[PDB]
C-alpha cells in the first residue's frame, strides 16, 4: 500500500536515521514524489529530480533549510526573546541574488592552497589520538579521535578560542536539534534555553573578534570584508553564521568519517584492500560518501508554482529531498547497493549539494576523512567492530552513529614489528579523485585468440569474488602498460553475471601503442589495471522497436543491447557485417540467442548490407543503435537527418584524438550560470583545466575527445567542437560540449554548471 506509506511517513525514527535510502526505497522505485502529512512536506527521492532542484535556487529557495519542525510556543518565543535570539540567514539558507554575492565576497579562504595548509595539523592530531589508545585493544573511535580532529581543525579555521569543549558540544547539540530535529513539547523549553545561550556566546565571540579584526580565521576575515561590503556582510549575517558555522564546520565531517569507518569495517575484503594499498583511500572515501554518506535529507521551498515529477506544486510548498536516496538511485549509479570502491562516478554523490550552494568546506572534509582512514588502516588493520547497538540522534538532515566501538589484539599491532610504518605518508587528494585514482586490479582469467588480430579477454577479481553489475553499452578502460595509455573497450559479457567481464580487443594496424601492447603482452594470469565500468552509450529500454547495426569489432556493445532487447521482449533485428570470415566473433553464441533475428554479411564473399534500403523500410518509432567504422556511422546519420520519425544513436571507436595546439587557438570566456562565476580560458588551457582550477567538479577520462565523460551543458554561445563523440546534429544544437577539448566560436559561452 504505497498510499499508506506516504500517509505514515515520518523520518524522526531510527529506521530513517540508520538507512534512509532503504527507508524510502519504495518511493524511489514507485512514487518519486508524495505528500507527507505528518510533516506538511513533499518528499522527492530520485537523483535527476534532486539535481535539477539544486540547479535552480530562484525557484527552489533554501529558506527552510534551517527551519525547526516545532510550533514555537509563546513560551519558547519568550525564552528565546530573553537572549535577543535573532538567527536569520547565513549562507546555506540565503536567497538569491544576495547569496551568490556574499559567497563571492567570503569564499576566498576556502581555496585549495589555504586548505592544503591544514594538512600538517590534521596529521599531527590524528597521530596524537591513535597514540593514546593503540595498546589498549578496545576503543570508541568517535570519542577517542573522530570527533576531536574536525572539531579542533574547525575552531582553528574559524579563529575561535578552544577552551570549553563541554559547553561547545552542548551548544552544538541544541543548535542541531533546533534546526533539523523535532523535540517533543516537554523538551522544547530546555532546548530553547541552550540555543539562547549559544546565540549570546556567539555575540561575545563576535565582539572580541571585532576588537582583534586583524587576527586569524575566517570570521575575522568576514569582519574585515564587512568594512568593504556593509550591505552584503551584515551584522545579522555575521552573528547567525557564527552560530551555524561552529557546528557545520565539524559535525558533518565527524559523521562522514564515522560512517566511512563503519562501512569499511563491515566489508572486510575492502578494508583488507585499503590496508595493503593506501592509494585506494581517496576512491574508497568517495564511495563511502555515496554508499553511507552523512546527508539524509535536505530541504527547499518553492517560490512559484512549478511542476515536479509530474505534479503541480503551489507556491510555498515544502520539499524534502532525500539525498541518501538519490545516492542509491539505479538511474545514475549501476548496481547501487554494491559497495564498490572502484565505482568510477562515485564522486557524483550529492552529499555536498550541487551548484550555487555547493559545500565550501568539502575538500577539507575529504582531506580529514582520508588522513583518519589512512592512519587507522596502517596501524590497526586487524581491528574489527565490537558488538554494540548503534544510536543515532534524530534529525532530518545529518546521520551517523554516536559511537563506534572497535577491538583488536595489540600484540599483533604491525608497528611493533615495523616501527617505520609511522614514517609513511600517503599524499593527500585535494578534491574528488581523478580517473587514474579510481582503478581496480584485475586478473586475466582466460585469453582466446579467434583470429590473428582479435583477442578476447575474460577478466575477474584476483580472488574471484563478485564484480558489480553494469548496463548494456558500458565500457572499461585498460591501462595498456602505463596509467596514461588507457584505452576504452566495450563490455560484452552478460551484464548481470558478476563472475567475470569479457572484452574483445582488435589489434589496430596503426596502433598508437595500446592495442599493440595488449596483443603483445597479455596472457592468462596477468594482472591488469582497469577503470570503469562507465556507460556513455545507454540503451533506451522503452523504445517500441530496435534496429541494431554492428560493423566489425563494433559488435561488442551492440550485442549486449540486442540481448537486452530480447529479455525485455521488444522487437529487434541484429545486423552484423565483417570483411573477412575469420573476423567473425561470437557468431555461434549470437545464433543461439537471436536465431532468425541475426543477419551476417561477409564482404570478402561479396555480400554487403545495403543501409539505405534497410533504413527506408524502418517504421516510425524505431530506435537504431549502431557501432562501426566512421564512414558507416556518417552514412546512417545522413540517412536519418531526413527521417525525423526514427532516431539514431551511435558509438564511435575510431575517432581522431584531439590535441590542443595553443598557437592556433584564442582565449574565450565561460559563464558558469549555476555557480555564479565567470572565468577566462586562455589559448594554452583547455576548458576542463580551467574548471578544475576554480574547483568546479567535472569528471574526465581520456581527456582527448574520444570517450565523452567530460560533457557539459551549454545554454548560450556557439561551440567550436573538437571531440569525436557528437553527431553533426548534436554539434549544431550547441547544447552538449566535451570540455576536455572543445572551445568557442563566440567570444563567450554560458554553461549550466
Ligand atoms: C565533510 C562533510 C560535509 C558535508 C557532507 C557538508 C554538507 C554541506 C551541504 C549539504 C551544504 C549545502 C549544499 C547545497 O545546498 O547545495 C553545505 C554548504 C556549506 N558548507 Fe558543508 N559539508 C561538509 C563539510 C563542510 C566543512 C568542513 C565546512 C567549513 C569548514 C563546510 C562549510 C559549508 C558552508 C560555508 C556552506 C555554505 C555554502 C553556501 O551556501 O554558499 N562544509 N555543506
Ligand atoms: C567507447 C569506446 C569503446 C571502444 N571499444 C572497443 C572495443 O570493444 N574493441 C576494440 O578493439 N576497440 C574499442 N575501442 C577503440 C579502443 O579504445 C582503442 O582506441 C583502439 O584499441 C586503438 O588503440 P591504440 O591506437 O592505442 O592501439 C573503443 C573506443 C571507445 C571510445
Ligand atoms: S574526457 Fe574523454 S571526451 Fe573529454
Residue numbers in the entry: 27 to 779
Would you copy out the relevant sentences from the publication that reported this structure?
Notably, CYP116B46 from T. thermophilus is a highly potent and thermostable protein. A more recent report describes its activity in catalyzing region- and enatio-selective C-H-lactonizations of saturated fatty acids.
The crystal structure was determined at 2.13-Å resolution. The electron density map showed a continuous chain from residues 27 to 779, and the corresponding protein model was built unambiguously. The ferredoxin domain is located between the heme domain and the reductase domain, packing against one another. The interfaces between the domains are mainly constituted by hydrogen bonds and salt bridges and the buried areas are: heme domain and reductase domain, 835.1 Å2; reductase domain and ferredoxin, 619.8 Å2; heme domain and ferredoxin, 580.6 Å2. The binding sites for each of the prosthetic groups, heme, FMN and binuclear Fe-S cluster ([2Fe-2S]), were found in the heme domain, the reductase domain, and the ferredoxin domain, respectively. An imidazole molecule was modeled into the electron density map because a high concentration of imidazole was present in the crystallization solution (0.1 M). Notably, the C8 methyl group of FMN is very close to the Fe2 of the binuclear cluster (7.9 Å), a distance that permits an efficient electron shuttle between the redox centers in an iron-sulfur flavoprotein reductase of the phthalate dioxygenase system. In contrast to the close proximity of FMN and [2Fe-2S], the edge-to-edge straight-line distance between the [2Fe-2S] cluster and the heme group is 25.3 Å. The distance is too long for efficient electron transfer between the two redox centers, and therefore some amino acid residues or additional co-factors on the path should be involved in relaying the redox equivalents.
